[PDB]
Structure 1
Amino acid sequence: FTEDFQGLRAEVETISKELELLDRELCQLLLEGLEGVLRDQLALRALEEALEQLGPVEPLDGPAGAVLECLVLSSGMLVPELAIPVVYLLGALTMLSETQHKLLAEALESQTLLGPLELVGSLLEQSAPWQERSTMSLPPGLLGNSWGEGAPAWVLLDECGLELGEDTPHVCWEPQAQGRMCALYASLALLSGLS
């Protein structure tokens, strides 16, 4: 496809559009599982090794088993119609730091995904092309009350590679933050579709 943000948006939403095969009951169970997985460095690696991008997977313990018990048949066989959307989510979580993983668990818990979901989305579309350093500035329409040092929307962008500012042009886009910003948007977009 395209290397733009609209080419990433179509790449991501094709994983969400057919994720409607997940029921409302399973969506909240997968959400309660991914919340505990994002709080454990070990459970995320244990879950990712179990999925492994044929054979039945053994049941796990803790939050890792909570997610895996939402994606297997009675015999333990992985359903490829639903396991691949999840392994695309984890493929976007390996590119994120553990600090961002915890702040996603706070967003999943207090129902605050839509806060920085569009903020990252608007920053990824106005920063085209990704190959150049550009001095941007978020509008007051995207938050502006939460903004500040140590804020959830601040730490999620600082851990990507962006040099943030409280005043002036608030955000400075660096091309090295491209990989983590696309993964941070993919994580927030897929989790919002599951919500």
Structure 2
Amino acid sequence: TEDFQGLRAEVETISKELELLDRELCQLLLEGLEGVLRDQLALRALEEALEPVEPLDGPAGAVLECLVLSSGMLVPELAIPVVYLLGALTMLSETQHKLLAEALESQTLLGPLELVGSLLEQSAPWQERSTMSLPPGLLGNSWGEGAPAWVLLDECGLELGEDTPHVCWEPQAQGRMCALYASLALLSGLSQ
């Protein structure tokens, strides 16, 4: 029960809600996010930081300094966009986690978003099995087993094959794909 225009629009509006962060808050945030993706100490310390905050060290602390005023108070229109993000991460594998981190410290956020975006917009709709043919330029340097675009989708539960074919959409990939989409998306937006 979703069309991807809802998803994209839903994720788009949240993407704008973090446009508040100016420069350092913008590049210090995704810096400290990049920690919790390769480190669970921060992922689970940040997830439990929210639920009147106090100071925190390390990577999860780097994300709290953007959300808080001079008391412990989190700004709701800021704090919620990130809670929406960490949930999208709860869905992903830890392998997908390390990859996001690895795509982050490179320009390579936008490429896969365009790839996930097509495959999501191609699967018509998210329930029925779909044929889902692969976009030409977005599959990476050498596409195949180890390829960082392969294990992204593969760890969403997609059955893939070698000579640039389509890939059968199994609706069980929806939340992992919608989450890989949405997380890819928010991150690239802050890169901007």
TM-score bracket, normalised by the shorter chain, equals over 0.9
Give the gaps of 5 or more residues in structure 2.
none
SS of the residue aligned with 1:8?
A: helix
Q: Report the counterpart of residue 117 of structure 1 in structure 2.
A: 113
Q: What per-residue deviation string (whole Å, max 9, x for no partner) do you get for residues 46-94 of structure 1?
A: 1011113xxx112222211111122111112111121111111111111
SS of the residue aligned with 2:131?
A: strand
Deviation at 1:111, TM superposition (A): 2.0
Q: 1:107 to 1:100 in 2, by over 3 A?
A: same
Q: What per-residue deviation string (whole Å, max 9, x for no partner) do you get for residues 8-61 of structure 1?
A: 111100101232211122110001100111111121011011113xxx112222
Deviation at 1:136, TM superposition (A): 2.5
Structure 1 ranges of 4+ moved more than 3 A? 143-146
Q: 1:57 to 1:4 in 2, by over 3 A?
A: same
Q: Distance in 2 between matches of 1:20 and 1:41?
A: 27
Q: What per-residue deviation string (whole Å, max 9, x for no partner) do you get for residues 96-128 of structure 1?
A: 111001000110012210121110000000011
State which drifts further: 125-134 or 167-176.
167-176
SS of the residue aligned with 2:162?
A: coil
Query: Quick check: which one's strand share is greater?
Result: 1
Q: Report the counterpart of residue 15 of structure 1 in structure 2.
A: 14
Q: Distance in 2 between matches of 1:180 and 1:139?
A: 20
C-alpha contact (below 8 Å) 2:158/2:169 kept by paired residues: yes
Q: Distance in 1 between matches of 2:153 and 2:84?
A: 21
SS of the residue aligned with 2:38?
A: coil
Q: 1:25 to 1:147 in 2, by over 3 A?
A: same
C-alpha contact (below 8 Å) 1:163/1:172 kept by paired residues: yes
SS of the residue aligned with 1:184?
A: helix
SS of the residue aligned with 1:11?
A: helix
C-alpha contact (below 8 Å) 2:131/2:168 kept by paired residues: yes
Deviation at 1:168, TM superposition (A): 5.4
Q: Distance in 2 between matches of 1:67 and 1:98?
A: 20
In the superposition, the TM-score normalised over structure 2's length comes to: 0.94
Q: Distance in 2 between matches of 1:51 and 1:97?
A: 22
State which drifts further: 139-148 or 107-116.
139-148
SS of the residue aligned with 2:70?
A: coil
In the superposition, the TM-score normalised over structure 1's length comes to: 0.93
C-alpha contact (below 8 Å) 1:19/1:82 kept by paired residues: yes
Q: 1:141 to 1:50 in 2, by over 3 A?
A: same
Q: 1:64 to 1:173 in 2, by over 3 A?
A: same
Q: Distance in 1 between matches of 2:156 and 2:5?
A: 20
C-alpha contact (below 8 Å) 1:146/1:153 kept by paired residues: no
Give the gaps of 5 or more residues in structure 1.
none
| Aligned length in residues | 191
In angstroms, what is the RMSD of aligned CA positions?
A: 1.4
Q: Percent identity?
A: 100
